[PDB]
Write an enzyme that holds these catalytic residues in place. Sequence first.
Site, PDB file in Angstrom:
ATOM      1  N   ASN A   1      26.860  46.608  28.850  1.00  8.01           N
ATOM      2  CA  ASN A   1      27.974  45.962  28.348  1.00  8.01           C
ATOM      3  C   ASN A   1      28.815  45.469  29.397  1.00  8.01           C
ATOM      4  O   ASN A   1      30.157  45.429  29.237  1.00  8.01           O
ATOM      5  CB  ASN A   1      29.012  46.601  27.091  1.00  8.01           C
ATOM      6  CG  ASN A   1      29.606  45.679  26.419  1.00  8.01           C
ATOM      7  OD1 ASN A   1      29.489  44.736  25.568  1.00  8.01           O
ATOM      8  ND2 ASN A   1      31.156  46.075  26.692  1.00  8.01           N
ATOM      9  N   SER A   2      28.484  45.382  30.733  1.00  8.55           N
ATOM     10  CA  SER A   2      29.303  45.416  32.106  1.00  8.55           C
ATOM     11  C   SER A   2      29.773  43.914  31.876  1.00  8.55           C
ATOM     12  O   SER A   2      29.203  43.261  31.225  1.00  8.55           O
ATOM     13  CB  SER A   2      28.543  45.598  33.182  1.00  8.55           C
ATOM     14  OG  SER A   2      27.372  44.933  33.307  1.00  8.55           O
TER      15      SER A   2
ATOM     16  N   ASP B   1      35.414  31.955  23.701  1.00  9.24           N
ATOM     17  CA  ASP B   1      35.942  33.096  22.437  1.00  9.24           C
ATOM     18  C   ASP B   1      36.651  32.854  21.556  1.00  9.24           C
ATOM     19  O   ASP B   1      36.470  33.092  20.284  1.00  9.24           O
ATOM     20  CB  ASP B   1      36.229  34.209  23.476  1.00  9.24           C
ATOM     21  CG  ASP B   1      36.093  35.565  22.752  1.00  9.24           C
ATOM     22  OD1 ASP B   1      35.177  35.965  21.817  1.00  9.24           O
ATOM     23  OD2 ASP B   1      37.012  36.606  23.065  1.00  9.24           O
TER      24      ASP B   1
ATOM     25  N   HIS C   1      37.635  33.403  15.925  1.00 10.39           N
ATOM     26  CA  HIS C   1      36.808  33.697  16.912  1.00 10.39           C
ATOM     27  C   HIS C   1      35.849  32.665  17.115  1.00 10.39           C
ATOM     28  O   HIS C   1      34.365  32.713  16.804  1.00 10.39           O
ATOM     29  CB  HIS C   1      36.066  35.196  16.241  1.00 10.39           C
ATOM     30  CG  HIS C   1      35.304  35.801  17.280  1.00 10.39           C
ATOM     31  ND1 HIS C   1      34.305  36.615  17.173  1.00 10.39           N
ATOM     32  CD2 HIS C   1      35.355  35.871  18.717  1.00 10.39           C
ATOM     33  CE1 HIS C   1      34.005  37.306  18.086  1.00 10.39           C
ATOM     34  NE2 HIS C   1      34.433  36.800  19.097  1.00 10.39           N
TER      35      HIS C   1
ATOM     36  N   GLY D   1      19.004  25.440  24.979  1.00  8.79           N
ATOM     37  CA  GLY D   1      19.101  23.980  25.396  1.00  8.79           C
ATOM     38  C   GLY D   1      18.867  22.958  24.195  1.00  8.79           C
ATOM     39  O   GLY D   1      19.447  22.046  24.014  1.00  8.79           O
TER      40      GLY D   1
ATOM     41  N   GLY E   1      25.124  34.241  20.375  1.00  8.84           N
ATOM     42  CA  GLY E   1      24.961  32.958  21.104  1.00  8.84           C
ATOM     43  C   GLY E   1      26.329  31.980  21.485  1.00  8.84           C
ATOM     44  O   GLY E   1      25.954  31.064  21.884  1.00  8.84           O
ATOM     45  N   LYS E   2      27.432  32.604  21.546  1.00  7.48           N
ATOM     46  CA  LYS E   2      28.614  32.000  21.706  1.00  7.48           C
ATOM     47  C   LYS E   2      28.846  31.392  23.173  1.00  7.48           C
ATOM     48  O   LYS E   2      28.675  30.376  23.383  1.00  7.48           O
ATOM     49  CB  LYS E   2      29.851  32.648  21.543  1.00  7.48           C
ATOM     50  CG  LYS E   2      30.669  32.562  20.191  1.00  7.48           C
ATOM     51  CD  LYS E   2      31.860  32.811  20.038  1.00  7.48           C
ATOM     52  CE  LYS E   2      32.235  34.140  20.519  1.00  7.48           C
ATOM     53  NZ  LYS E   2      33.699  34.400  20.726  1.00  7.48           N
TER      54      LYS E   2
ATOM     55  N   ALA F   1      26.537  38.750  20.820  1.00  7.28           N
ATOM     56  CA  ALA F   1      25.204  39.109  20.619  1.00  7.28           C
ATOM     57  C   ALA F   1      24.571  37.897  19.780  1.00  7.28           C
ATOM     58  O   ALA F   1      23.110  37.991  19.840  1.00  7.28           O
ATOM     59  CB  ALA F   1      24.677  40.247  20.218  1.00  7.28           C
TER      60      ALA F   1
HETATM   61  N1  LIG Z   1      16.370  32.737  20.244  1.00  7.77           N
HETATM   62  C1  LIG Z   1      17.384  32.301  20.568  1.00  7.77           C
HETATM   63  N2  LIG Z   1      18.515  33.440  21.310  1.00  7.77           N
HETATM   64  C2  LIG Z   1      19.399  33.023  21.703  1.00  7.77           C
HETATM   65  C3  LIG Z   1      19.913  31.804  21.616  1.00  7.77           C
HETATM   66  N3  LIG Z   1      21.261  31.785  22.144  1.00  7.77           N
HETATM   67  C4  LIG Z   1      21.397  33.083  22.471  1.00  7.77           C
HETATM   68  N4  LIG Z   1      20.316  33.784  22.150  1.00  7.77           N
HETATM   69  C5  LIG Z   1      20.107  35.188  22.680  1.00  7.77           C
HETATM   70  O1  LIG Z   1      21.443  35.877  22.587  1.00  7.77           O
HETATM   71  C6  LIG Z   1      21.705  36.989  23.451  1.00  7.77           C
HETATM   72  C7  LIG Z   1      23.069  36.172  24.097  1.00  7.77           C
HETATM   73  O2  LIG Z   1      23.697  35.320  23.497  1.00  7.77           O
HETATM   74  P1  LIG Z   1      25.225  35.205  24.266  1.00  7.77           P
HETATM   75  O3  LIG Z   1      25.560  33.793  24.513  1.00  7.77           O
HETATM   76  O4  LIG Z   1      25.492  36.102  25.173  1.00  7.77           O
HETATM   77  O5  LIG Z   1      26.110  35.667  22.772  1.00  7.77           O
HETATM   78  P2  LIG Z   1      27.483  36.102  22.932  1.00  7.77           P
HETATM   79  O6  LIG Z   1      27.769  37.296  22.812  1.00  7.77           O
HETATM   80  O7  LIG Z   1      27.555  35.601  21.421  1.00  7.77           O
HETATM   81  O8  LIG Z   1      28.188  35.414  23.842  1.00  7.77           O
HETATM   82  C8  LIG Z   1      20.798  36.853  24.603  1.00  7.77           C
HETATM   83  O9  LIG Z   1      19.773  37.803  24.156  1.00  7.77           O
HETATM   84  C9  LIG Z   1      20.258  35.401  24.238  1.00  7.77           C
HETATM   85  O10 LIG Z   1      18.972  34.962  24.584  1.00  7.77           O
HETATM   86  C10 LIG Z   1      19.118  31.040  20.732  1.00  7.77           C
HETATM   87  O11 LIG Z   1      19.441  29.803  20.710  1.00  7.77           O
HETATM   88  N5  LIG Z   1      17.899  31.203  20.423  1.00  7.77           N
END
Ligand SMILES: Nc1nc2c(ncn2[C@@H]2O[C@H](COP(=O)(O)OP(=O)(O)O)[C@@H](O)[C@H]2O)c(=O)[nH]1
Length: 592
Positions: free
Chosen positions: A380-381, A289, A242, A502, A267-268, A265
């Site tokens: 979750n759309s 992913d 993963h 970033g 940060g991937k 949820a």
């Molecule tokens: N504080 C913080 N929040 C983050 C960071 N990266 C992602 N998030 C938060 O985590 C959630 C989304 O991460 P996402 O990239 O969609 O995660 P995935 O579900 O793992 O793909 C959002 O609420 C983002 O703002 C980070 O570096 N710092």
Amino acid sequence: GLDTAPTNHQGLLSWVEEVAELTQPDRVVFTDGSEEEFQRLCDQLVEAGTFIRLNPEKHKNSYLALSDPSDVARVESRTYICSAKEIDAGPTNNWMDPGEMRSIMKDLYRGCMRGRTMYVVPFCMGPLGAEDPKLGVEITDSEYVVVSMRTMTRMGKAALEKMGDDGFFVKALHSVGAPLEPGQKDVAWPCSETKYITHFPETREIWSYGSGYGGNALLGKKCYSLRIASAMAHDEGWLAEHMLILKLISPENKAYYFAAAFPSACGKTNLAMLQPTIPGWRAETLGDDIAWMRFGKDGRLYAVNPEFGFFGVAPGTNWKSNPNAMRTIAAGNTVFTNVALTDDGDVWWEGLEGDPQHLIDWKGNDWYFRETETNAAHPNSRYCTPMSQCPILAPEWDDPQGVPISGILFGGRRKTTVPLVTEARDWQHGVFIGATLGSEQTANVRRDPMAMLPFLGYNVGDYFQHWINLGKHADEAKLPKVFFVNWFRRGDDGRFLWPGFGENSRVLKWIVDRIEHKAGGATTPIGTVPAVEDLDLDGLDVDAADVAAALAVDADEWRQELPLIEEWLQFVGEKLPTGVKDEFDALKERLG
Ligand SMILES: Nc1nc2c(ncn2[C@@H]2O[C@H](COP(=O)(O)OP(=O)(O)O)[C@@H](O)[C@H]2O)c(=O)[nH]1
Ligand SMILES: [Mg+2]
């Protein structure tokens, strides 16, 4: 049924018949992956009412689809690993005797495809040029499944070709479980209250019944790419994980590839489409992913993305926070599931720009600003979009021999205790950091080993062993360094010590520098962790005390952590490898 099919693969030709005879469709159809077919199917789906065609000035060739409020994700509780012996599923998985499960599902399948087309959907996981690509055939009565599989897998004529007359493939069976009676008018989203998503590791088969949604129905996306794949990995010498695959590009001009496993949820998607904030750095993606990794002839670990599109969460995606994601959906050819319809035939979701006063929501009802109490988009759309539309896609994305991985990253959300970044002491310590990955949490600190908790196709403990073993038997000079990051540590007033996003490129910089022997790092009980001095903060509007706090390894806090690790390790049970207990003992010894 309708067998004037374009192949002489008998094994396949049998199986299709055996299934048709059980499920009793009106016709069998073999899908080819053509643009022409894609349009037919979308037209049939728009006539059926399942797809709404989006206003085409605004979006080339894109659609919105609304599902029944009852299949909307998930159902890990209806998800099973049916290995022969229960121990080979293990305590992270739901098991049932395989014979008992065959009984249940053959009953379920009997006549389930009745008044419906049965699509035979061949596909390839991975680039397609590989020597021995990993292939599969999904039978399904859902067109939505067909369309979505076309973007998410290399689908159709090419894959059918790669199968030869006797080439092996994963047999993957899906039905929505809503047979029609001969009079009957259908619904826009057929599904059932009964749901099973069943994985047979020894025969390498997936049986899905009841849901037409996401990873319950698009069988490559998790069923194949992690569950069956991991079991393949075990038996064959590699790793199905993963992980995002990121390609970081230094000021001139070196490429470093990273693999990172965070739970959803955490940060991937952000890290995979990072825009670096330090001058001269670029980033490109190979995936966000799934990573399949194998050892190269000399002597490194190489990553490939087995998938062919993105299946991202829509809510919260926007031009500020992910414009790469946004440019990708702008190129169109995209299917949105459970987002809202704008007054002029466009789509919208909470977090997107604008503040439309009226909408039609994902249930098809009128929605109103500062009034309706429900989200306009399902939270979750999704969007389903071709990888090749992504403007930062690395040119080696379709390259079968993959990319050499320099670092493997693990992480999750921890408000306290885990520093912003820590380097492993060695491979076996690396596995233990992965193995112990904790995130708060829920659905307060959940253990989610290598972010694979819901996706292992066999016993956790043996999966760890497999990780140790691939390390024991390899040149440690050539192994990836392993790191453990945490973007989410908080201070006493509850703000984030680290600004993240970033600016996480600063942490990646330290990882690169560490590979190019040019940054420092204290030995601590949990591993090597930079001082603030060791990180490139130039240009960052942030308090150096915050940064040192993020970086603290606090003996007291970690003393509090050890019993939670321990519970988790006890829970892993009799397959817990010695290596992992050794490392746990070691961590305990260095904390005193
Ligand atoms: N504080 C913080 N929040 C983050 C960071 N990266 C992602 N998030 C938060 O985590 C959630 C989304 O991460 P996402 O990239 O969609 O995660 P995935 O579900 O793992 O793909 C959002 O609420 C983002 O703002 C980070 O570096 N710092
Ligand atoms: Mg989590």
